[PDB]
Scaffold this active site. Structure first.
Site, short mmCIF file in Angstrom:
data_model
loop_
_atom_site.label_atom_id
_atom_site.label_comp_id
_atom_site.label_asym_id
_atom_site.label_seq_id
_atom_site.Cartn_x
_atom_site.Cartn_y
_atom_site.Cartn_z
N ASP A 139 9.34 53.93 -10.89
CA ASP A 139 8.30 54.53 -10.07
C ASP A 139 7.38 55.39 -10.92
O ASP A 139 6.99 56.50 -10.53
CB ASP A 139 8.89 55.35 -8.92
CG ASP A 139 7.89 55.61 -7.81
OD1 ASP A 139 6.79 55.02 -7.85
OD2 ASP A 139 8.20 56.40 -6.90
N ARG A 143 0.90 60.08 -9.98
CA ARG A 143 1.43 61.03 -9.01
C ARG A 143 2.80 61.56 -9.41
O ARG A 143 3.17 62.66 -8.99
CB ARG A 143 1.52 60.37 -7.63
CG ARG A 143 2.45 59.17 -7.58
CD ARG A 143 2.49 58.53 -6.21
NE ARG A 143 3.38 57.37 -6.19
CZ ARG A 143 3.03 56.15 -6.56
NH1 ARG A 143 1.80 55.88 -6.96
NH2 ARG A 143 3.93 55.17 -6.52
C1 LIG Z 1 0.69 65.43 -6.40
C2 LIG Z 1 1.37 66.35 -5.69
C3 LIG Z 1 1.80 67.62 -6.34
O1 LIG Z 1 2.51 67.50 -7.32
N1 LIG Z 1 1.45 68.90 -5.89
C4 LIG Z 1 1.80 70.19 -6.44
C5 LIG Z 1 2.99 70.40 -7.16
C6 LIG Z 1 3.41 71.62 -7.72
N2 LIG Z 1 4.64 71.74 -8.44
C7 LIG Z 1 5.82 70.95 -8.42
N3 LIG Z 1 6.80 71.29 -9.30
C8 LIG Z 1 7.91 70.55 -9.28
C9 LIG Z 1 8.13 69.48 -8.41
C10 LIG Z 1 9.37 68.76 -8.50
O2 LIG Z 1 9.48 67.82 -9.17
O3 LIG Z 1 10.46 69.19 -7.87
C11 LIG Z 1 10.77 68.69 -6.58
C12 LIG Z 1 11.85 69.53 -5.92
C13 LIG Z 1 11.25 67.25 -6.75
C14 LIG Z 1 7.08 69.16 -7.51
C15 LIG Z 1 7.07 68.06 -6.52
C16 LIG Z 1 7.84 66.91 -6.51
N4 LIG Z 1 7.53 66.10 -5.43
C17 LIG Z 1 8.15 64.84 -5.10
C18 LIG Z 1 6.53 66.70 -4.70
C19 LIG Z 1 5.89 66.27 -3.54
C20 LIG Z 1 4.90 67.07 -3.03
C21 LIG Z 1 4.57 68.27 -3.66
C22 LIG Z 1 5.22 68.67 -4.80
C23 LIG Z 1 6.22 67.90 -5.36
N5 LIG Z 1 5.96 69.91 -7.54
C24 LIG Z 1 2.52 72.69 -7.52
O4 LIG Z 1 2.84 73.90 -8.04
C25 LIG Z 1 2.45 75.01 -7.29
C26 LIG Z 1 1.33 72.51 -6.81
C27 LIG Z 1 0.92 71.29 -6.26
N6 LIG Z 1 -0.32 71.15 -5.54
C28 LIG Z 1 -0.45 71.73 -4.22
C29 LIG Z 1 -1.51 70.42 -6.07
C30 LIG Z 1 -2.86 70.74 -5.35
N7 LIG Z 1 -3.49 72.04 -5.81
C31 LIG Z 1 -2.97 72.40 -7.16
C32 LIG Z 1 -4.98 71.89 -5.94
#
Ligand SMILES: *CCC(=O)Nc1cc(Nc2ncc(C(=O)OC(C)C)c(-c3cn(C)c4ccccc34)n2)c(OC)cc1N(C)CCN(C)C
Length: 317
Positions: A139, A143
């Site tokens: 995968d 993203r």
């Molecule tokens: C593209 C979506 C996205 O990544 N958004 C996002 C993500 C994060 N930080 C973050 N850190 C670790 C992980 C992770 O791998 O751990 C989980 C428990 C598996 C994730 C994450 C992993 N998945 C599958 C997600 C799905 C949805 C959202 C996050 C994850 N994400 C941050 O840090 C604050 C921000 C963020 N955003 C909201 C992006 C949009 N703004 C930055 C503009």
């Protein structure tokens, strides 16, 4: 004969971490950002928390925890542990800048060739490590590449990852919602996944970056992709890409999986191009673009007293 997996699975007390905010819901569940404070240690670790009690869910979240606990590489997301509440939670390192797909779309006018080529090197380094661990991601996409800092990205999302036996060279899957537009042709026709099928997904991932987040085969329904690929059609050449970079993407999309480049070779090629980035990516205003690199944790969290904040990469066993 595949060597004992002596990796350690850490169990976290729910009282030790606080869900500060929610990052994104979906079919998986909800991913929260928060702080992990191990008791006694004066450290505050920014974490991401995923909760998917459909016995199945608890089963899938533990498979992902098993895989993530078995990997340790600077370009692969680090697992911190699990919490055994009513529903099982996945506790990983927080990547503050989000996924690379949203990042290139948000900062399109500030991403130079140096960052793009460096990201390609780092993704190949992480995938090469996964191949060393005999692990097929299945995968890989823009993203599923998270941004710790604009200079450091890591591969994430191991919900579909599989570990191959020392005699298993390929992985025969069965039914399952699978991202069609990132899969190799043999994965769509025969549901076979190898490290070379991950190379195909690597090429599509690079194409997402070089187009600053465009959707592959935009408008084409997924059921036509298998017939489009069989006729010889591939993703187009992005405008910023010289033929040198596009030739690498085309090689990742060969029908013969053994003819596609290996990850260790993708490291070398993009590393050469990273030493002269504007020779291989033509971007208007490349020499004036600047990306941040931050305090900002107080904002990304809420709490102040972020004087004892420690990134997960600096908090070792
Ligand atoms: C593209 C979506 C996205 O990544 N958004 C996002 C993500 C994060 N930080 C973050 N850190 C670790 C992980 C992770 O791998 O751990 C989980 C428990 C598996 C994730 C994450 C992993 N998945 C599958 C997600 C799905 C949805 C959202 C996050 C994850 N994400 C941050 O840090 C604050 C921000 C963020 N955003 C909201 C992006 C949009 N703004 C930055 C503009």
């Amino acid at each position: 004969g595949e060597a004992p997996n002596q990796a350690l699975l850490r169990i976290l007390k729910e009282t030790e971490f606080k869900k500060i905010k929610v990052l994104g819901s979906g079919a998986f569940g909800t991913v929260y950002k928060g702080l992990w404070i191990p008791e006694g240690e004066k450290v505050k670790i920014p974490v991401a928390i995923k909760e998917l009690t459909s016995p199945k869910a608890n089963k899938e979240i533990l498979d992902e925890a098993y895989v993530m606990a078995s990997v340790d590489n600077p370009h692969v997301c680090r697992l911190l542990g699990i919490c055994l509440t009513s529903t099982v939670q996945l506790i990983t390192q927080l990547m503050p800048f989000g996924c690379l797909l949203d990042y290139v779309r948000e900062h399109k006018d500030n991403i130079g060739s140096q960052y793009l080529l460096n990201w390609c090197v780092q993704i190949a380094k992480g995938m090469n490590y996964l191949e060393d661990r005999r692990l097929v991601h299945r995968d890989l996409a823009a993203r599923n590449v998270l941004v710790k800092t604009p200079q450091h990205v890591k591969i994430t999302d191991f919900g579909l990852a599989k570990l191959l036996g020392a005699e298993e060279k390929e992985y025969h899957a069965e039914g399952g919602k699978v991202p069609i537009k990132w899969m190799a042709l043999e994965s769509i026709l025969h549901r076979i996944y190898t490290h070379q099928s991950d190379v195909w997904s690597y090429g599509v991932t690079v194409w997402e970056l070089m187009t600053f987040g465009s959707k592959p085969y935009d408008g084409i329904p997924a059921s036509e992709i298998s017939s489009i690929l069989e006729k010889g059609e591939r993703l187009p050449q992005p405008p910023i890409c010289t033929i040198d970079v596009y030739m690498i993407m085309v090689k990742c999309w060969m029908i013969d999986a053994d003819s596609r480049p290996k990850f260790r070779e993708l490291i070398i090629e993009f590393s050469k191009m990273a030493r002269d980035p504007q020779r291989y990516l033509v971007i208007q205003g490349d020499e004036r673009m600047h990306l941040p690199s931050p305090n900002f944790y107080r904002a990304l969290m809420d709490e102040e007293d972020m004087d004892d904040v420690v990134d997960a990469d600096e908090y070792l066993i």
